[PDB]
Amino acid sequence: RIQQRTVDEVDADIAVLAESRRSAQNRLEKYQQLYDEDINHGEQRAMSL
Amino acid sequence: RREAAQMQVEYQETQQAHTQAQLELLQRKFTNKALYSWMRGKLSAIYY
Incomplete structure (x- = not known):
């Protein structure tokens, strides 16, 4: 039982x-997922403008 | 695991209980210290 x-x-x-x-x-x-997506379009727009 | 330790406790408990009962057997056996005591005394007296 014990075993x-x-x-x-x-x-x-x-x-x-x-x-x-x-x-x-x-x-x-x-x-x-968080790493592959890297930088999304919002920051792209920030830098571009 | 706690429940395991617990029935380990009662394992050792049953072991102690039946070794006590075995002691009771060894006392209550036919050829006990009473028979041997009587035989020793009677033999020693008649021997002397």
Whole structure:
């Protein structure tokens, strides 16, 4: 029984790390979109005028 | 994990309980200190 509980514990830790991964990749792709778009048309207009 | 530690506690608890019961068995066995005490005394007297 005790070892059943321990394998349960490690499975829970797997889930914890998995949702950690989801959060990290969210931050990543948000940064990536924010970086690729670089400078939008508003600042282009500011500099041009 | 806390619940795991808890049934570990009661694990050790049951282990202690049944080792106590085993002690009770060893006392209550047929060839106990009463039988050996009687035999020692009677043999020693007759031997002397």
